Design a protein around this ligand. Structure first.
Ligand SMILES: [K+]
Ligand SMILES: [K+]
Ligand SMILES: [K+]
Ligand SMILES: [K+]
Ligand SMILES: [K+]
Ligand SMILES: [K+]
Ligand SMILES: [Mg+2]
Ligand SMILES: [Mg+2]
Ligand SMILES: [Mg+2]
Ligand SMILES: [Mg+2]
Ligand SMILES: [Mg+2]
Ligand SMILES: [Mg+2]
Ligand SMILES: [Mg+2]
Ligand SMILES: [Mg+2]
Ligand SMILES: [Mg+2]
Ligand SMILES: [Mg+2]
Ligand SMILES: [Mg+2]
Ligand SMILES: [Mg+2]
Ligand SMILES: [Mg+2]
Ligand SMILES: [Mg+2]
Ligand SMILES: [Mg+2]
Ligand SMILES: [Mg+2]
Ligand SMILES: [Mg+2]
Ligand SMILES: [Mg+2]
Ligand SMILES: [Mg+2]
Ligand SMILES: [Mg+2]
Lengths: 313, 196, 101, 132, 165, 569, 49, 88
RNA sequence: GGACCUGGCGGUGCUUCAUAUCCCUCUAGAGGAGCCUGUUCUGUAAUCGAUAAACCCCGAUCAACCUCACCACCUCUUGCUCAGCCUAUAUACCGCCAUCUUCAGCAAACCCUGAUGAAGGCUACAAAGUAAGCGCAAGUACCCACGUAAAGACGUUAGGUCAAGGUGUAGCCCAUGAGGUGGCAAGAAAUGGGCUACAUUUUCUACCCCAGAAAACUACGAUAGCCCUUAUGAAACUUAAGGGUCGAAGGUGGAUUUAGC
């Protein structure tokens, strides 16, 4: 499926006319009708529940639909345009030639937030197919260009091939400090452990009382291990007997409920400790949701992993 | 010569036409009548989603071309003459309970098929608060023992569910009959009640 | 024009069971209680035992309505597992899909 | 190896449509259903009856428009209406299509006791999605 | 039962057995039965206006009619004759110009080479087969695999000639 | 919602391959669909046991098989009544004879119910699915036989006999039977008098004064018997006076004023009969002018209900006069009345609907501004009707009068889409207008693209089975349009067609060919022009040869060639 | 009702309005078996008489 | 139409079942299917019977294929006249 | 017969491997007892199919009659069907699958090498390979980007299924088809899988985790046997549930062997 330029020019004329029709159907101004409005109108008029979005109805600009095709590589006389045409990889080798030439001129003259683009991204800047070893050679040559005393002209060039590897901050989000009718400051948070869900209210000041579904914590959790989990957050920050807690938990078993309450109290407690203490709680595993949940049983075997006995042969 | 198909009539449509006239009622997607370059289909490698002509995936969709925001607003303007006004005095739920202490629940089921029948539609549920009934101390005590679990002390609501008759109007008349015999028997005092 | 002779026998069993259902119900009610005399219940036992064999509903078999397969049938669609899958795997059964979770 | 509803790879000369090119595990992911009704929803009845009717309608239309269907039928039910959407070829004369439409709609309405409608979309040839 | 019937493609794929273990390691022809059939024509011989007969006749719409018993016999007999003729043509065998011997490929002409992509042509060249050999190779899975090795010669009868495998 | 102007009527399949592309297909596609529905109903009624499973709730009586056969096989009165309801003329008569020979009594109400069936269908079986000029009331028929054998005869017995005779054009017998009814001291009903009024006029051919004297006698008889006239009594009078035309114009208006006074409201049929009566061939300005103007002031803004079988003929008649009078303001009032309420359903069958719009649009193209003409052209075609090839010619004549020829290529595109691709009168009309005068280069190029498409129509005609025919004007026009557009290469190729078909070339074409040669400085081509005009012996050729000598350099061979044509000179 | 479906479609095939590909296949196989000499015997005139 | 309406989404339901994959034997190889039922609840309040008949007819006729509806109507009634007082 | 090519195989070499994985290491088991259930043998007038890995609670998400295809006896003959056949052939097949796969390869169309033989086609500081498509991958489902599902080509075992249904070939047509009544489906024995146990981290009761008793011939231990009742059914020594009675082997299991990150 090759697409000529006269074909794309016709597709763009149809999209502009169809864009004014769609704005007319929805009763909106055709002038201020954006692509976001198009996607919203198409989702309403042609509702599709298919799980794969690439298989749903779409009405986009042709430039965003058809694949970028390389233009003619020679004229009417048959002479190729580029002097590296007969290598079959003119774009790649034209880039290696330019980078190699800059490394020479330098000799005659003389990390955290960025990454090298992947091979599939380089194959789009060049519009050519590359080998794995072709990609390594080009990266090894760019790294050799950074170690040199590259100037401004040699720095804008290298940045063309560096992609931003945005690192999301692991800093815990602090809950707001609210006030009740009596003016007592408190914080609220939630936690989940297996099928148990908890919601804790940690007061800024207290005597160490904990109420679980309106029951004293040692009466609700008669097992000592469960009470040790409620002690972990407050003891790790040296705050036993300094806060009152009222939590509600439902679902799961006794140990899962103690785990959900531990996470809920730890999150709410972060509002009354210093930033450095919050980072210590995070590195102690007190602010992470445990993703370990029961695995389904599969057909043809005894359990989630347990297989039926391989019959004696 | 073979029959040559005419060009699609979307080429004759103006961009400022009255679209509701093209799709007045629910109808399947017609490529020759929808002037949109819409595509659908998981594309092949270095391909594009299939065009609308002969596109079965666009035919499977229950489209809403007959329910554009412009059409809905014109439809509702013509349906206002059929509506009646809710009484202004009934502003809150507590005020409705005061004047209308009985609530009747019924359900209608809309399915696809040749038969409109559904046995679940006969069920009737009647709710009423004993505070709304003229019951003295003795009657309210006797009424609660007669109905059993049909009464909820927390809400003070008596729920009578009837579904032993074929029709819903019969189950409704029976629910009102039950409420009537329960009310008059609660006020009646037998001699064996003295042995409580 | 039914799939096979075994389906035709089940068609006749369902027809005869429908014709005698009311009679069998009334006679059975006389037998299923401790209120009526034994002398009357013993006569009711003989009466229902004298009805045709193919009027007994326990002899009806839920066979696949397209292949007559007597087992592996899904009651909701009245199809054998093989026929059901053929229709489901071609996307011809509304709302039915492969399950992955 | 799995077989169900899989057009197997060949020499690159077998044209397949979009529906034929997707195995069963793509239903609801990349392809929709060919019939839409409420029978298979939770708490709904008569799924068995809707299924028999669908199987018959597909055989009826296949033999009533022999060599004309360019794709599978799409069966839609709303209320007691039955809509049949078919993609056909442009080989038969229009007169014969109008005869068969008037004939099939009337015959099916009396057979299943419901208003039946048939919507035809013509194509110059079978739409090819890929060559396996 | 009407619900146990299958399509023609399914029926021919099973009956022909072109696929199967019997056809893998050296271990019937299809016939299109819809070929000469006309939509609307049936055994009873009804004439449906607008389907198998003209819709209008003498400016008026025709009505439902049925061919007489004698007139329908002619239609049936005419359809059988049309079938025999169609089948007879297939049984007809083309006259082959044999090569060196009756059953050999050597000496048989293959025609001119195919025209090149750039509008290049070779109508002046004739092609001749010199040898056809069935070569076999042993593979891990399939085992004894069968292939064809051919030797052909080309030439324009004016000094330019060549050969290739 | 309003009508979609880009679509064909809703009854057709909305598909570019199945949509009707002409008024002929618009009629045949619906007949093919109705034919398929008849075949389905024929099968449903022939094999009812296949369609008896009722799964619908609520029950749908209109989707069950019909049973046209009598189910009572006993010979008795109750069994005869069944064959009368099924309208079995032959079986009912046989059942009546056998029942009569046996000596059993048959009630009077049933004997009348048998005459109603025989008198209506004329002792013939009604039409079924599968098993004009002249009188259809045979001398000896089952109706008269049963009527004579009838023991007791009441008023209804004579009435149904008189109505049956007139229905089947036995006018003379019906009048004779009406005399017996009077001799027996009986009173007829209004429906019997309606048939007698039709017999009095159609029985014998006489002058108006004689017929008008008999009709006024029946009406006075109808008043003596205390019978009130209905709408059909006055509609039959007006419909029967259509023969006399001028003599019945004033008497017909007396019937109209007679309806209004009595209280009978004239229907659309009443004005249709008055419209046709006054619409006699001649000069309609004398009378027909103020009759349609007064009928529209009365019908203005009225919603009509079906009262007479001929109510669906008014709009066809009203629009036919508007075109004769060439009154567009009146045509808008007629079309305005058709658009109020549900009046649009009185337009009539397809043949009447196409006639109505043909006259209405042809009057718009003539008397309306071109900007408004093109709005009606888009609102009516193809949404309301498919145009006749003569309507496309009236539209081109309107564009010419408006000096808007840039629309000609669009009318040709639409002409092909309406089945007028191979109409000789249309392609000649289009080419003449395009090649009548010279236009700016932008328009001259567009006309060449249309002339090229028209040329393809002449080449690939369905008449191609017959030797292709190229009118002389078409060839001269197509050639001139290529020259004026710069496509000289295409114009020189066509010169061979003038010799192949032996078509005289136009003088203007030959002169413009020279100008294209002097620009290219091609002496051979210039000689090829002189060679062509020489073959037909045109006088301009001799003078043209002089032009060629001076303008172009003449080689010795070319000079001898002209000398050869000079030898012919 | 398998009788209804089978009988209806058999009638429509004899009326020329329904093409039964499966039945056409069976008819062709049965026709070629007669030419091959493998025809169904008459009741009572089987190979065992 | 001036009707007060709220919307919420009840939790979906997924019914799953298992079937053999082969026509014969091979018990430990199955194919599993499911039917997903998604919900949407429109809650309308304080409307008369005439307004309810028009709105329901309008949205029921436009019910897409494959979508079922269960409409529960809570009617307001007054006490029957026999219940307003005891007989004695 | 000589010399080669490819494949297979080697109680064939070197090097590097298997991550619940070949061996040791970790945990719970199987192999010993009773019982449940499949199979093989034996038995019976009395189905069929699967049957090394890849059969053996497998076709069956299921057999008291029915189901049923089996046996005995009796009956019908254009037959529920424009007949019928669970008759043969899965080594004629479609359909749906097992298996390697807990793989990463398959391949049209070309090009080149070997003197234009069967054949072969890579080295990145590169030396003849280019490759659409298919698979893997990517995406999607489930609670994530993790995991688990799903997916998994071409081929291998003429692997499985003519008894899901359909069907080629061959065969039966007063019978190899159809119907009715009754009946078989057992255990000398062997063996696979599973259940319950042999107990003190246990048994019983209360409670759902701060208790009281039991604890070796009245203990632990049968879901077995026997008797009774009930449930379903027209039909129950027979199927299921409950109760009573009964209180056995078993005292932690050799070689060998299964599963799990
Ligand atoms: K080797
Ligand atoms: K197979
Ligand atoms: K089979
Ligand atoms: K077979
Ligand atoms: K074991
Ligand atoms: K063990
Ligand atoms: Mg486990
Ligand atoms: Mg059963
Ligand atoms: Mg698998
Ligand atoms: Mg020979
Ligand atoms: Mg053991
Ligand atoms: Mg066995
Ligand atoms: Mg075996
Ligand atoms: Mg076997
Ligand atoms: Mg038996
Ligand atoms: Mg049995
Ligand atoms: Mg048998
Ligand atoms: Mg095999
Ligand atoms: Mg993943
Ligand atoms: Mg898997
Ligand atoms: Mg994958
Ligand atoms: Mg085998
Ligand atoms: Mg037998
Ligand atoms: Mg004990
Ligand atoms: Mg026991
Ligand atoms: Mg019992």
């Amino acid at each position: 499926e090759t697409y000529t330029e006269d074909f794309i020019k016709k597709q763009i004329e149809e999209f502009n006319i169809g864009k004014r029709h769609l704005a007319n159907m929805m009763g909106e101004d055709p002038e201020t009708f954006t692509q976001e409005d198009i996607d919203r109108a198409i989702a309403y008029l042609f509702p599709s529940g298919l799980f794969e979005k690439r298989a749903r109805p779409v009405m986009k600009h042709p430039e965003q639909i058809f694949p970028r095709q390389r233009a003619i590589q020679w004229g009417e006389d048959g002479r190729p345009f580029h002097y590296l045409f007969y290598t079959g990889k003119q774009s790649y080798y034209s880039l290696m030639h330019d980078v190699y030439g800059m490394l020479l001129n330098l000799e005659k003259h003389q990390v955290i937030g960025s990454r090298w683009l992947i091979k599939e991204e380089l194959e789009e800047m060049l519009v050519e197919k590359l080998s794995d070893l072709d990609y390594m050679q080009f990266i090894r040559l760019l790294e050799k260009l950074l170690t040199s005393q590259c100037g401004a002209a040699e720095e804008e060039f290298v940045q063309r091939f560096r992609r931003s590897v945005t690192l999301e901050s692991k800093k815990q989000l602090i809950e707001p400090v609210q006030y009740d009718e009596q003016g007592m400051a408190f914080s609220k948070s939630e936690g989940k452990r297996k099928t148990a869900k908890a919601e804790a209210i940690v007061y800024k000041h207290g005597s160490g009382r904990i109420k679980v579904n309106g029951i004293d914590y040692q009466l609700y959790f008669p097992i000592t291990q469960d009470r040790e989990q409620l002690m972990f957050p407050f003891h790790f920050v040296d705050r036993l007997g300094k806060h009152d807690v009222t939590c509600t938990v439902s679902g799961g078993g006794r140990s899962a409920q103690a785990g959900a309450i531990r996470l809920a109290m730890a999150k709410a407690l972060c509002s009354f400790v210093t930033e450095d203490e919050v980072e210590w709680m995070r590195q102690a595993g007190l602010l992470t949701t445990d993703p370990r949940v029961r695995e389904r049983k599969k057909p043809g075997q005894e359990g989630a992993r347990r297989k039926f006995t391989w019959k004696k042969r | 010569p073979r029959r040559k198909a005419l060009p699609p009539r979307t080429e004759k449509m103006a961009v400022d036409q009255d679209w509701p006239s093209v799709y007045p009622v629910a109808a399947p997607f017609k490529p020759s009548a929808v002037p949109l370059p819409v595509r659908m289909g998981y594309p092949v490698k270095k391909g594009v989603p299939m065009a609308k002509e002969g596109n079965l995936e666009l035919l499977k969709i229950p489209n809403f071309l007959h329910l554009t925001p412009v059409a809905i607003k014109k439809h509702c303007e013509a349906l206002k003459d059929f509506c009646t006004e809710w009484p202004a005095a009934l502003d809150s739920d507590e005020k409705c309970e005061k004047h209308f202490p009985i609530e009747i629940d019924s359900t209608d089921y809309v399915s696809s098929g040749p038969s409109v029948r559904n046995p679940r539609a006969r069920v009737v549920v009647l709710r009423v608060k004993l505070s709304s009934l003229n019951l003295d101390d003795h009657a309210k005590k006797k009424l609660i023992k007669l109905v059993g679990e049909r009464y909820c002390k927390t809400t003070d609501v008596l729920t009578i569910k009837t579904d032993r008759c074929p029709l819903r109007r019969q189950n409704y008349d029976y629910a009102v009959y039950l409420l009537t015999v329960l009310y008059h028997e609660s006020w009646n005092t037998e001699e064996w009640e003295k042995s409580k | 024009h039914y799939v096979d002779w075994r389906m035709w026998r089940d068609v006749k069993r369902r027809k005869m069971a429908y014709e005698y259902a009311d009679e069998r119900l009334r006679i059975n009610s006389l037998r299923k209680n401790t209120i009526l005399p034994k002398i009357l219940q013993d006569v009711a036992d003989e009466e229902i035992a004298a009805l045709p064999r193919d009027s007994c509903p326990v002899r009806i078999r839920n066979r696949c309505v397209m292949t007559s397969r007597p087992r592996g049938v899904k009651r909701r669609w009245r199809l054998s597992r093989i026929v059901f899958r053929h229709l489901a795997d071609h996307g011809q059964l509304s709302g039915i899909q492969r399950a992955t979770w | 190896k799995n077989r169900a509803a899989r057009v197997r790879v060949s020499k690159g000369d077998k044209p397949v449509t979009y529906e034929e090119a997707h195995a069963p595990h793509y239903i609801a992911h990349r392809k929709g259903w060919l019939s839409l009704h409420t029978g298979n929803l939770d708490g709904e009845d008569h799924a068995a009856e809707r299924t028999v009717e669908d199987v018959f309608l597909r055989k009826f239309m296949w033999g009533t428009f022999p060599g004309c269907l360019a794709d599978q039928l799409v069966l839609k039910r709303r209320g007691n209406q039955l809509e049949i959407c078919a993609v056909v070829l442009r080989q038969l004369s229009p007169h014969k299509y109008y005869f068969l439409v008037g004939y099939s709609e009337t015959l099916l309405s009396y057979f299943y006791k419901c208003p039946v409608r048939l919507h035809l979309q013509t194509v110059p040839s079978k739409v090819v999605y890929k060559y396996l | 039962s009407f619900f146990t019937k299958l399509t023609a493609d399914e029926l021919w794929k099973g009956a022909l057995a072109e696929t199967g273990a019997g056809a893998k390691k050296g271990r019937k022809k299809r016939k299109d039965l819809n070929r000469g059939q006309i939509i609307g024509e049936g055994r009873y011989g009804f004439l449906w206006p607008g389907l198998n007969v003209p819709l209008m006749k003498n400016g008026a719409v025709q009505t439902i009619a049925q061919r007489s018993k004698e007139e329908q016999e002619k239609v049936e007999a005419d359809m059988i004759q049309q079938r025999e003729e169609w089948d007879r043509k297939k049984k007809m065998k083309v006259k082959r110009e044999r090569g060196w011997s009756g059953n050999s490929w050597g000496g048989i002409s293959l025609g001119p080479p195919d025209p090149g992509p750039c509008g290049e042509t070779y109508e002046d060249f004739d092609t001749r087969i010199l040898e056809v050999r069935n070569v076999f190779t042993m593979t891990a899975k399939e085992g004894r695999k069968k292939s064809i090795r051919v030797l052909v010669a080309v030439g324009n009868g004016k000094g330019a000639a060549g050969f290739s495998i | 919602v309003n009508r979609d102007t880009t679509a064909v009527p809703y009854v057709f399949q909305d598909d570019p391959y199945l949509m009707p592309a002409s008024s002929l297909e618009s009629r045949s596609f619906l007949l093919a669909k109705k034919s398929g529905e008849n075949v389905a109903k024929f099968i449903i009624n022939s094999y009812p046991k296949y369609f008896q499973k009722d799964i619908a709730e609520p029950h749908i009586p209109c989707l069950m098989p019909e049973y046209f056969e009598p189910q009572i096989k006993d010979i008795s009165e109750a069994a005869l009544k069944e064959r009368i309801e099924l309208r079995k003329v032959k079986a009912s008569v046989d059942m009546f004879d056998q029942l009569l020979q046996a000596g059993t009594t048959v009630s009077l109400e049933t004997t009348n119910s048998l005459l109603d069936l025989l008198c209506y269908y004329g002792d013939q079986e009604p039409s079924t699915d599968y098993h004009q000029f002249g009188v259809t009331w045979r001398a000896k028929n089952n109706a008269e036989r049963i009527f004579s054998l009838m023991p007791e005869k009441n008023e209804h017995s004579y009435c149904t006999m008189i109505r049956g005779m007139v229905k089947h054009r036995a006018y003379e017998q019906a009048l004779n039977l009406y005399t017996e009814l009077l001799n027996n001291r009986l009173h007829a009903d209004v429906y019997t008098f309606n048939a007698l009024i039709e017999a009095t006029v159609c029985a014998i051919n006489e002058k108006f004064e004689e017929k008008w004297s008999k009709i006024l006698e029946l009406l006075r008889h109808m008043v003596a018997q205390k019978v009130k006239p209905n709408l059909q009594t006055f509609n039959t009078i007006l419909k029967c006076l259509r023969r006399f035309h001028v003599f019945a114009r004033s008497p017909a208006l007396q019937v109209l004023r007679e309806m209004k006074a009595i209280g009978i409201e004239p229907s659309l049929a009443t004005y249709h009969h008055i419209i046709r009566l006054f619409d006699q061939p001649g000069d309609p300005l004398k009378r027909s002018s103020f009759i349609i103007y007064d009928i529209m002031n009365e019908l203005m803004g009225k919603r009509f209900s079906p009262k007479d079988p001929d109510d669906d003929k008014f709009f066809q008649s009203a629009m036919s006069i508007c075109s004769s009078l060439r009154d567009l303001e009146l045509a808008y009032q007629v079309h305005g009345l058709l658009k109020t309420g549900d009046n649009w359903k009185f337009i009539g069958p397809d043949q009447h609907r196409n006639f109505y719009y043909s006259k209405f649009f042809d009057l718009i193209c003539l008397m309306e501004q071109i900007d408004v003409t093109l709005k009606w052209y888009e609102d009516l075609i193809p949404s309301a009707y498919f145009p006749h090839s003569q309507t496309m010619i009236h539209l081109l004549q309107a564009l010419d009068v408006a000096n808007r020829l840039e629309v000609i290529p669009k009318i040709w595109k639409d002409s092909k889409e309406y089945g007028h691709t191979f109409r000789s009168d249309l392609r000649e009309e289009i080419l003449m207008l395009m090649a009548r005068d010279k236009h700016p280069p932008e328009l001259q190029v567009a006309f060449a693209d249309c002339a090229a498409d028209i040329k393809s129509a002449y080449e690939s005609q369905p008449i191609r089975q017959t030797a292709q025919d190229w009118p002389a004007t078409s060839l001269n026009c197509i050639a001139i349009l290529f020259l004026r557009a710069g496509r000289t290469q295409e114009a020189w190729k066509m010169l061979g067609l003038f010799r192949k078909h032996n078509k005289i070339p136009r003088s203007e074409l030959l002169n413009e060919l020279m100008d294209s040669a002097k620009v290219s400085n091609s002496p051979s081509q210039a000689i090829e022009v002189v060679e062509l005009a020489s073959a037909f012996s045109l006088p301009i050729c001799e003078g043209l040869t002089q032009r060629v000598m001076s303008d172009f350099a003449i080689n010795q061979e070319q000079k001898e060639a002209l000398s050869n044509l000079t030898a012919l000179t | 009702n398998h009788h209804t479906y089978a009988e209806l479609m058999q009638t429509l095939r004899f009326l020329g309005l329904y093409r039964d590909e499966h039945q056409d296949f069976m008819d062709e196989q049965k026709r070629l078996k007669k030419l091959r000499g493998k025809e169904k015997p008459k009741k009572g005139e089987g190979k065992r008489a | 139409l001036g009707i007060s309406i709220k919307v919420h989404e009840p939790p979906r339901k997924i019914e799953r079942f298992t079937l053999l994959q082969s026509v014969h034997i091979y018990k430990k190889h199955r194919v599993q299917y499911e039917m997903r039922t998604l919900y949407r609840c429109l809650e309308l309040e304080h409307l008369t019977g005439s307004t309810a008949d028009v709105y329901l007819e309008y949205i029921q006729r436009n019910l897409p294929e494959g979508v079922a509806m269960e409409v529960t109507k809570t009617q307001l009634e007054q006490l029957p006249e026999h219940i307003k007082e005891p007989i004695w």
